mmCIF file of all heavy atoms in Angstrom:
data_model
loop_
_atom_site.group_PDB
_atom_site.id
_atom_site.type_symbol
_atom_site.label_atom_id
_atom_site.label_comp_id
_atom_site.label_asym_id
_atom_site.label_seq_id
_atom_site.Cartn_x
_atom_site.Cartn_y
_atom_site.Cartn_z
ATOM 1 N N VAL A 7 25.080 -45.692 106.266
ATOM 2 C CA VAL A 7 24.585 -44.345 106.534
ATOM 3 C C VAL A 7 25.004 -43.897 107.924
ATOM 4 O O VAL A 7 25.306 -42.717 108.143
ATOM 5 C CB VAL A 7 23.056 -44.289 106.371
ATOM 6 C CG1 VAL A 7 22.530 -42.905 106.709
ATOM 7 C CG2 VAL A 7 22.662 -44.683 104.972
ATOM 8 N N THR A 8 25.027 -44.820 108.887
ATOM 9 C CA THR A 8 25.540 -44.486 110.208
ATOM 10 C C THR A 8 27.031 -44.191 110.160
ATOM 11 O O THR A 8 27.527 -43.370 110.941
ATOM 12 C CB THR A 8 25.254 -45.619 111.196
ATOM 13 O OG1 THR A 8 25.861 -46.829 110.730
ATOM 14 C CG2 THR A 8 23.761 -45.838 111.343
ATOM 15 N N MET A 9 27.759 -44.844 109.252
ATOM 16 C CA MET A 9 29.187 -44.585 109.124
ATOM 17 C C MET A 9 29.439 -43.142 108.702
ATOM 18 O O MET A 9 30.113 -42.382 109.406
ATOM 19 C CB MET A 9 29.804 -45.568 108.129
ATOM 20 C CG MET A 9 31.306 -45.462 108.027
ATOM 21 S SD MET A 9 32.091 -45.868 109.594
ATOM 22 C CE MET A 9 31.828 -47.636 109.645
ATOM 23 N N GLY A 10 28.887 -42.741 107.561
ATOM 24 C CA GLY A 10 28.891 -41.353 107.158
ATOM 25 C C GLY A 10 29.983 -40.934 106.198
ATOM 26 O O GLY A 10 30.039 -39.750 105.844
ATOM 27 N N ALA A 11 30.843 -41.849 105.755
ATOM 28 C CA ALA A 11 31.910 -41.462 104.839
ATOM 29 C C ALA A 11 31.294 -41.076 103.502
ATOM 30 O O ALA A 11 30.653 -41.902 102.847
ATOM 31 C CB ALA A 11 32.910 -42.602 104.672
ATOM 32 N N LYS A 12 31.533 -39.837 103.075
ATOM 33 C CA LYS A 12 30.661 -39.201 102.091
ATOM 34 C C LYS A 12 30.894 -39.738 100.685
ATOM 35 O O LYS A 12 29.966 -40.241 100.048
ATOM 36 C CB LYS A 12 30.837 -37.682 102.117
ATOM 37 C CG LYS A 12 29.912 -36.973 101.145
ATOM 38 C CD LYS A 12 28.458 -37.285 101.466
ATOM 39 C CE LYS A 12 27.507 -36.523 100.565
ATOM 40 N NZ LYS A 12 26.102 -36.990 100.721
ATOM 41 N N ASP A 13 32.121 -39.603 100.179
ATOM 42 C CA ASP A 13 32.412 -39.892 98.774
ATOM 43 C C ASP A 13 31.809 -41.214 98.305
ATOM 44 O O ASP A 13 31.329 -41.313 97.169
ATOM 45 C CB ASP A 13 33.926 -39.868 98.555
ATOM 46 C CG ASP A 13 34.672 -40.729 99.549
ATOM 47 O OD1 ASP A 13 34.033 -41.247 100.487
ATOM 48 O OD2 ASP A 13 35.903 -40.869 99.406
ATOM 49 N N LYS A 14 31.814 -42.235 99.161
ATOM 50 C CA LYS A 14 31.170 -43.491 98.788
ATOM 51 C C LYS A 14 29.652 -43.414 98.934
ATOM 52 O O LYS A 14 28.925 -44.002 98.126
ATOM 53 C CB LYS A 14 31.738 -44.644 99.614
ATOM 54 C CG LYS A 14 31.191 -46.000 99.211
ATOM 55 C CD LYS A 14 31.613 -46.378 97.802
ATOM 56 C CE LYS A 14 31.001 -47.705 97.381
ATOM 57 N NZ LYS A 14 31.480 -48.834 98.212
ATOM 58 N N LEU A 15 29.154 -42.704 99.958
ATOM 59 C CA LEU A 15 27.714 -42.463 100.063
ATOM 60 C C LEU A 15 27.178 -41.811 98.796
ATOM 61 O O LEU A 15 26.014 -42.011 98.433
ATOM 62 C CB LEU A 15 27.398 -41.586 101.282
ATOM 63 C CG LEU A 15 27.618 -42.090 102.715
ATOM 64 C CD1 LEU A 15 27.478 -40.944 103.692
ATOM 65 C CD2 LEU A 15 26.647 -43.176 103.095
ATOM 66 N N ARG A 16 28.016 -41.026 98.119
ATOM 67 C CA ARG A 16 27.699 -40.552 96.779
ATOM 68 C C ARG A 16 27.538 -41.714 95.812
ATOM 69 O O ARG A 16 26.769 -41.623 94.852
ATOM 70 C CB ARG A 16 28.803 -39.608 96.307
ATOM 71 C CG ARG A 16 28.608 -39.011 94.937
ATOM 72 C CD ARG A 16 29.836 -38.218 94.552
ATOM 73 N NE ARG A 16 31.009 -39.082 94.475
ATOM 74 C CZ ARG A 16 32.266 -38.647 94.446
ATOM 75 N NH1 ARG A 16 32.526 -37.346 94.482
ATOM 76 N NH2 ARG A 16 33.264 -39.513 94.376
ATOM 77 N N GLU A 17 28.252 -42.811 96.049
ATOM 78 C CA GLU A 17 28.213 -43.963 95.165
ATOM 79 C C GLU A 17 27.242 -45.041 95.626
ATOM 80 O O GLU A 17 27.152 -46.088 94.978
ATOM 81 C CB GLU A 17 29.616 -44.556 95.014
ATOM 82 C CG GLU A 17 30.625 -43.594 94.397
ATOM 83 C CD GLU A 17 30.182 -43.067 93.047
ATOM 84 O OE1 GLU A 17 29.598 -43.844 92.266
ATOM 85 O OE2 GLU A 17 30.417 -41.874 92.767
ATOM 86 N N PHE A 18 26.518 -44.822 96.727
ATOM 87 C CA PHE A 18 25.501 -45.786 97.134
ATOM 88 C C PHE A 18 24.222 -45.641 96.322
ATOM 89 O O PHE A 18 23.567 -46.639 96.008
ATOM 90 C CB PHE A 18 25.181 -45.645 98.619
ATOM 91 C CG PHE A 18 26.260 -46.136 99.530
ATOM 92 C CD1 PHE A 18 26.250 -45.799 100.868
ATOM 93 C CD2 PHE A 18 27.254 -46.969 99.065
ATOM 94 C CE1 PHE A 18 27.227 -46.256 101.718
ATOM 95 C CE2 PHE A 18 28.232 -47.436 99.917
ATOM 96 C CZ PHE A 18 28.219 -47.073 101.245
ATOM 97 N N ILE A 19 23.826 -44.407 96.003
ATOM 98 C CA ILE A 19 22.641 -44.207 95.163
ATOM 99 C C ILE A 19 22.828 -44.835 93.789
ATOM 100 O O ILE A 19 21.863 -45.410 93.259
ATOM 101 C CB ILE A 19 22.269 -42.718 95.118
ATOM 102 C CG1 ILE A 19 21.865 -42.253 96.518
ATOM 103 C CG2 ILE A 19 21.132 -42.467 94.134
ATOM 104 C CD1 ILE A 19 21.749 -40.771 96.656
ATOM 105 N N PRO A 20 24.006 -44.778 93.153
ATOM 106 C CA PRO A 20 24.235 -45.636 91.980
ATOM 107 C C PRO A 20 24.001 -47.111 92.247
ATOM 108 O O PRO A 20 23.681 -47.857 91.312
ATOM 109 C CB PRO A 20 25.702 -45.357 91.633
ATOM 110 C CG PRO A 20 25.924 -43.974 92.091
ATOM 111 C CD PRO A 20 25.068 -43.767 93.302
ATOM 112 N N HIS A 21 24.160 -47.564 93.490
ATOM 113 C CA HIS A 21 23.823 -48.946 93.810
ATOM 114 C C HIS A 21 22.320 -49.123 93.974
ATOM 115 O O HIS A 21 21.759 -50.128 93.525
ATOM 116 C CB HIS A 21 24.546 -49.396 95.076
ATOM 117 C CG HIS A 21 26.036 -49.374 94.962
ATOM 118 N ND1 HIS A 21 26.865 -49.484 96.056
ATOM 119 C CD2 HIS A 21 26.846 -49.252 93.885
ATOM 120 C CE1 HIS A 21 28.123 -49.432 95.660
ATOM 121 N NE2 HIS A 21 28.138 -49.291 94.346
ATOM 122 N N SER A 22 21.651 -48.162 94.616
ATOM 123 C CA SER A 22 20.198 -48.219 94.710
ATOM 124 C C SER A 22 19.533 -48.106 93.347
ATOM 125 O O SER A 22 18.344 -48.420 93.226
ATOM 126 C CB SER A 22 19.681 -47.129 95.654
ATOM 127 O OG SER A 22 20.019 -45.838 95.191
ATOM 128 N N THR A 23 20.262 -47.646 92.332
ATOM 129 C CA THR A 23 19.853 -47.852 90.948
ATOM 130 C C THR A 23 20.203 -49.266 90.502
ATOM 131 O O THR A 23 19.328 -50.047 90.113
ATOM 132 C CB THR A 23 20.522 -46.819 90.037
ATOM 133 O OG1 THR A 23 21.943 -46.965 90.116
ATOM 134 C CG2 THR A 23 20.149 -45.412 90.463
ATOM 135 N N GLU A 24 21.497 -49.593 90.540
ATOM 136 C CA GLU A 24 21.998 -50.901 90.132
ATOM 137 C C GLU A 24 21.243 -52.044 90.801
ATOM 138 O O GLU A 24 20.701 -52.928 90.129
ATOM 139 C CB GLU A 24 23.490 -50.982 90.463
ATOM 140 C CG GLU A 24 24.144 -52.307 90.140
ATOM 141 C CD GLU A 24 24.228 -52.578 88.655
ATOM 142 O OE1 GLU A 24 24.003 -51.642 87.860
ATOM 143 O OE2 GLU A 24 24.530 -53.731 88.282
ATOM 144 N N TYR A 25 21.191 -52.041 92.132
ATOM 145 C CA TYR A 25 20.719 -53.204 92.881
ATOM 146 C C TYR A 25 19.201 -53.205 93.062
ATOM 147 O O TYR A 25 18.531 -54.156 92.646
ATOM 148 C CB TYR A 25 21.420 -53.279 94.240
ATOM 149 C CG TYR A 25 21.028 -54.499 95.039
ATOM 150 C CD1 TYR A 25 21.641 -55.726 94.817
ATOM 151 C CD2 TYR A 25 20.022 -54.435 95.994
ATOM 152 C CE1 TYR A 25 21.282 -56.846 95.545
ATOM 153 C CE2 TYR A 25 19.652 -55.548 96.722
ATOM 154 C CZ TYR A 25 20.285 -56.750 96.492
ATOM 155 O OH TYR A 25 19.921 -57.859 97.220
ATOM 156 N N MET A 26 18.651 -52.156 93.693
ATOM 157 C CA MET A 26 17.252 -52.149 94.134
ATOM 158 C C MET A 26 16.281 -52.608 93.052
ATOM 159 O O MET A 26 15.179 -53.075 93.365
ATOM 160 C CB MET A 26 16.837 -50.745 94.584
ATOM 161 C CG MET A 26 17.494 -50.197 95.834
ATOM 162 S SD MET A 26 17.059 -51.060 97.356
ATOM 163 C CE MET A 26 18.577 -51.937 97.688
ATOM 164 N N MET A 27 16.651 -52.464 91.781
ATOM 165 C CA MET A 27 15.766 -52.851 90.693
ATOM 166 C C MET A 27 15.829 -54.335 90.346
ATOM 167 O O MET A 27 14.953 -54.811 89.619
ATOM 168 C CB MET A 27 16.085 -52.029 89.441
ATOM 169 C CG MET A 27 15.790 -50.549 89.583
ATOM 170 S SD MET A 27 16.223 -49.595 88.119
ATOM 171 C CE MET A 27 14.943 -50.126 86.987
ATOM 172 N N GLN A 28 16.827 -55.087 90.824
ATOM 173 C CA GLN A 28 16.970 -56.452 90.328
ATOM 174 C C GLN A 28 15.979 -57.415 90.964
ATOM 175 O O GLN A 28 15.706 -58.469 90.380
ATOM 176 C CB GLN A 28 18.395 -56.983 90.527
ATOM 177 C CG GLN A 28 18.804 -57.313 91.953
ATOM 178 C CD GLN A 28 20.216 -57.881 92.020
ATOM 179 O OE1 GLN A 28 21.029 -57.659 91.123
ATOM 180 N NE2 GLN A 28 20.502 -58.637 93.070
ATOM 181 N N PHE A 29 15.441 -57.087 92.141
ATOM 182 C CA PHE A 29 14.330 -57.859 92.685
ATOM 183 C C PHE A 29 13.011 -57.457 92.039
ATOM 184 O O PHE A 29 12.197 -58.319 91.691
ATOM 185 C CB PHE A 29 14.267 -57.693 94.202
ATOM 186 C CG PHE A 29 15.415 -58.331 94.921
ATOM 187 C CD1 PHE A 29 15.819 -57.874 96.160
ATOM 188 C CD2 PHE A 29 16.108 -59.382 94.339
ATOM 189 C CE1 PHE A 29 16.884 -58.464 96.807
ATOM 190 C CE2 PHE A 29 17.168 -59.977 94.987
ATOM 191 C CZ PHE A 29 17.557 -59.520 96.221
ATOM 192 N N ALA A 30 12.792 -56.156 91.867
ATOM 193 C CA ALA A 30 11.651 -55.640 91.122
ATOM 194 C C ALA A 30 12.153 -54.520 90.228
ATOM 195 O O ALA A 30 12.698 -53.530 90.723
ATOM 196 C CB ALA A 30 10.550 -55.135 92.060
ATOM 197 N N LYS A 31 11.979 -54.676 88.916
ATOM 198 C CA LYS A 31 12.440 -53.657 87.980
ATOM 199 C C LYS A 31 11.611 -52.383 88.038
ATOM 200 O O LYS A 31 11.959 -51.407 87.366
ATOM 201 C CB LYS A 31 12.440 -54.209 86.555
ATOM 202 C CG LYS A 31 13.465 -55.296 86.314
ATOM 203 C CD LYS A 31 13.350 -55.840 84.906
ATOM 204 C CE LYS A 31 14.395 -56.908 84.650
ATOM 205 N NZ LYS A 31 14.270 -57.484 83.284
ATOM 206 N N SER A 32 10.537 -52.364 88.821
ATOM 207 C CA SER A 32 9.711 -51.177 88.941
ATOM 208 C C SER A 32 10.501 -50.047 89.591
ATOM 209 O O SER A 32 11.576 -50.254 90.163
ATOM 210 C CB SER A 32 8.451 -51.472 89.752
ATOM 211 O OG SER A 32 7.652 -50.308 89.881
ATOM 212 N N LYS A 33 9.967 -48.834 89.455
ATOM 213 C CA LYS A 33 10.671 -47.633 89.884
ATOM 214 C C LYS A 33 11.167 -47.768 91.315
ATOM 215 O O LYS A 33 10.428 -48.178 92.214
ATOM 216 C CB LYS A 33 9.758 -46.410 89.762
ATOM 217 C CG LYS A 33 8.521 -46.461 90.645
ATOM 218 C CD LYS A 33 7.716 -45.188 90.551
ATOM 219 C CE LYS A 33 6.514 -45.239 91.476
ATOM 220 N NZ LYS A 33 5.552 -46.305 91.084
ATOM 221 N N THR A 34 12.449 -47.481 91.505
ATOM 222 C CA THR A 34 13.026 -47.327 92.827
ATOM 223 C C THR A 34 13.116 -45.869 93.238
ATOM 224 O O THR A 34 13.672 -45.571 94.297
ATOM 225 C CB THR A 34 14.399 -47.992 92.884
ATOM 226 O OG1 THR A 34 15.258 -47.410 91.899
ATOM 227 C CG2 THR A 34 14.258 -49.475 92.604
ATOM 228 N N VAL A 35 12.580 -44.957 92.419
ATOM 229 C CA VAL A 35 12.640 -43.527 92.706
ATOM 230 C C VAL A 35 12.031 -43.202 94.060
ATOM 231 O O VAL A 35 12.282 -42.125 94.611
ATOM 232 C CB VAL A 35 11.942 -42.716 91.594
ATOM 233 C CG1 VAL A 35 12.620 -42.958 90.250
ATOM 234 C CG2 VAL A 35 10.458 -43.048 91.539
ATOM 235 N N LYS A 36 11.215 -44.101 94.604
ATOM 236 C CA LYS A 36 10.824 -43.981 96.000
ATOM 237 C C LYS A 36 12.010 -44.279 96.912
ATOM 238 O O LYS A 36 12.408 -43.442 97.733
ATOM 239 C CB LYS A 36 9.654 -44.922 96.285
ATOM 240 C CG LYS A 36 8.392 -44.572 95.518
ATOM 241 C CD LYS A 36 7.294 -45.587 95.778
ATOM 242 C CE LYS A 36 6.010 -45.213 95.055
ATOM 243 N NZ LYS A 36 4.931 -46.213 95.282
ATOM 244 N N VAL A 37 12.617 -45.459 96.748
ATOM 245 C CA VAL A 37 13.813 -45.798 97.514
ATOM 246 C C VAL A 37 14.960 -44.876 97.131
ATOM 247 O O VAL A 37 15.723 -44.418 97.990
ATOM 248 C CB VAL A 37 14.185 -47.276 97.302
ATOM 249 C CG1 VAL A 37 15.475 -47.613 98.037
ATOM 250 C CG2 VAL A 37 13.050 -48.180 97.745
ATOM 251 N N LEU A 38 15.098 -44.588 95.833
ATOM 252 C CA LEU A 38 16.117 -43.650 95.377
ATOM 253 C C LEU A 38 15.974 -42.310 96.080
ATOM 254 O O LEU A 38 16.899 -41.850 96.747
ATOM 255 C CB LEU A 38 16.027 -43.458 93.866
ATOM 256 C CG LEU A 38 16.368 -44.661 93.005
ATOM 257 C CD1 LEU A 38 16.101 -44.335 91.556
ATOM 258 C CD2 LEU A 38 17.810 -45.034 93.205
ATOM 259 N N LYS A 39 14.802 -41.682 95.953
ATOM 260 C CA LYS A 39 14.584 -40.359 96.533
ATOM 261 C C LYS A 39 14.799 -40.371 98.039
ATOM 262 O O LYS A 39 15.484 -39.497 98.590
ATOM 263 C CB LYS A 39 13.174 -39.877 96.202
ATOM 264 C CG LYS A 39 12.851 -38.506 96.755
ATOM 265 C CD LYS A 39 11.441 -38.094 96.375
ATOM 266 C CE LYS A 39 11.080 -36.743 96.954
ATOM 267 N NZ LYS A 39 9.695 -36.356 96.577
ATOM 268 N N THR A 40 14.214 -41.358 98.723
ATOM 269 C CA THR A 40 14.355 -41.447 100.173
ATOM 270 C C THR A 40 15.820 -41.552 100.582
ATOM 271 O O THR A 40 16.262 -40.880 101.520
ATOM 272 C CB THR A 40 13.558 -42.641 100.700
ATOM 273 O OG1 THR A 40 12.171 -42.465 100.389
ATOM 274 C CG2 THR A 40 13.715 -42.775 102.205
ATOM 275 N N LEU A 41 16.594 -42.381 99.879
ATOM 276 C CA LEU A 41 18.013 -42.490 100.194
ATOM 277 C C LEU A 41 18.771 -41.232 99.795
ATOM 278 O O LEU A 41 19.795 -40.910 100.407
ATOM 279 C CB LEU A 41 18.606 -43.719 99.510
ATOM 280 C CG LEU A 41 18.060 -45.071 99.981
ATOM 281 C CD1 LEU A 41 18.613 -46.198 99.123
ATOM 282 C CD2 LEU A 41 18.366 -45.310 101.455
ATOM 283 N N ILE A 42 18.291 -40.514 98.777
ATOM 284 C CA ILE A 42 18.902 -39.244 98.399
ATOM 285 C C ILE A 42 18.813 -38.264 99.554
ATOM 286 O O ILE A 42 19.805 -37.637 99.940
ATOM 287 C CB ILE A 42 18.242 -38.669 97.133
ATOM 288 C CG1 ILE A 42 18.544 -39.529 95.906
ATOM 289 C CG2 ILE A 42 18.735 -37.268 96.898
ATOM 290 C CD1 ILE A 42 17.734 -39.163 94.685
ATOM 291 N N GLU A 43 17.617 -38.120 100.127
ATOM 292 C CA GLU A 43 17.481 -37.273 101.304
ATOM 293 C C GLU A 43 18.217 -37.860 102.500
ATOM 294 O O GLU A 43 18.646 -37.115 103.389
ATOM 295 C CB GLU A 43 16.004 -37.066 101.636
ATOM 296 C CG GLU A 43 15.225 -36.356 100.543
ATOM 297 C CD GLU A 43 15.814 -35.009 100.179
ATOM 298 O OE1 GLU A 43 16.264 -34.282 101.089
ATOM 299 O OE2 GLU A 43 15.826 -34.676 98.977
ATOM 300 N N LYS A 44 18.378 -39.186 102.539
ATOM 301 C CA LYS A 44 19.104 -39.815 103.638
ATOM 302 C C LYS A 44 20.585 -39.458 103.603
ATOM 303 O O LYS A 44 21.211 -39.282 104.654
ATOM 304 C CB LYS A 44 18.906 -41.331 103.596
ATOM 305 C CG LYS A 44 19.626 -42.086 104.703
ATOM 306 C CD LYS A 44 19.324 -43.573 104.656
ATOM 307 C CE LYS A 44 17.888 -43.848 105.065
ATOM 308 N NZ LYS A 44 17.643 -43.502 106.493
ATOM 309 N N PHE A 45 21.166 -39.358 102.408
ATOM 310 C CA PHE A 45 22.542 -38.906 102.263
ATOM 311 C C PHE A 45 22.672 -37.392 102.259
ATOM 312 O O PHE A 45 23.768 -36.874 102.497
ATOM 313 C CB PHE A 45 23.150 -39.455 100.971
ATOM 314 C CG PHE A 45 23.232 -40.953 100.928
ATOM 315 C CD1 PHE A 45 23.289 -41.616 99.716
ATOM 316 C CD2 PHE A 45 23.227 -41.698 102.092
ATOM 317 C CE1 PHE A 45 23.350 -42.986 99.669
ATOM 318 C CE2 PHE A 45 23.291 -43.072 102.045
ATOM 319 C CZ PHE A 45 23.352 -43.716 100.834
ATOM 320 N N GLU A 46 21.591 -36.676 101.959
ATOM 321 C CA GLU A 46 21.622 -35.222 101.966
ATOM 322 C C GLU A 46 21.487 -34.672 103.376
ATOM 323 O O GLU A 46 22.099 -33.648 103.700
ATOM 324 C CB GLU A 46 20.516 -34.680 101.059
ATOM 325 C CG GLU A 46 20.496 -33.172 100.906
ATOM 326 C CD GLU A 46 19.439 -32.704 99.919
ATOM 327 O OE1 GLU A 46 18.719 -33.563 99.365
ATOM 328 O OE2 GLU A 46 19.325 -31.478 99.702
ATOM 329 N N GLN A 47 20.703 -35.343 104.222
ATOM 330 C CA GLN A 47 20.607 -35.007 105.636
ATOM 331 C C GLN A 47 21.846 -35.390 106.422
ATOM 332 O O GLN A 47 21.896 -35.101 107.622
ATOM 333 C CB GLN A 47 19.379 -35.668 106.259
ATOM 334 C CG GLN A 47 18.064 -35.063 105.806
ATOM 335 C CD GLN A 47 17.941 -33.597 106.185
ATOM 336 O OE1 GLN A 47 18.370 -33.186 107.264
ATOM 337 N NE2 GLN A 47 17.348 -32.802 105.298
ATOM 338 N N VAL A 48 22.820 -36.043 105.791
ATOM 339 C CA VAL A 48 24.121 -36.305 106.404
ATOM 340 C C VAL A 48 24.645 -34.992 106.968
ATOM 341 O O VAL A 48 24.481 -33.941 106.329
ATOM 342 C CB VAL A 48 25.100 -36.919 105.390
ATOM 343 C CG1 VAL A 48 26.510 -36.917 105.934
ATOM 344 C CG2 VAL A 48 24.690 -38.337 105.067
ATOM 345 N N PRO A 49 25.223 -34.994 108.170
ATOM 346 C CA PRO A 49 25.731 -33.747 108.750
ATOM 347 C C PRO A 49 26.610 -32.991 107.763
ATOM 348 O O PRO A 49 27.288 -33.584 106.925
ATOM 349 C CB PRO A 49 26.522 -34.224 109.970
ATOM 350 C CG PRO A 49 25.811 -35.468 110.387
ATOM 351 C CD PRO A 49 25.310 -36.118 109.121
#
């Protein structure tokens, strides 16, 4: 996120779907949503 290269930052949320659930399959829509705004607040 500090790096800021966008096109892949578009592909990080697919990872927060892919990855974030494998430790706990429960909703990551908290982590998902927060990271969504984290990439949306990108300059």
Side-chain angles (χ1 to χ4, degrees):
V7 177
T8 59
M9 185 63 72
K12 182 59 176 171
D13 51 353
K14 184 65 183 296
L15 293 169
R16 181 186 62 195
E17 298 304 322
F18 288 165
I19 296 168
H21 298 167
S22 61
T23 61
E24 178 68 13
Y25 183 83
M26 293 293 107
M27 294 178 72
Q28 72 178 23
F29 292 154
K31 292 177 179 178
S32 179
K33 63 176 182 296
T34 58
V35 300
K36 296 177 178 179
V37 177
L38 293 175
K39 180 180 178 180
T40 299
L41 295 174
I42 292 170
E43 298 303 321
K44 180 177 290 294
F45 298 157
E46 184 176 0
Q47 289 298 322
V48 168

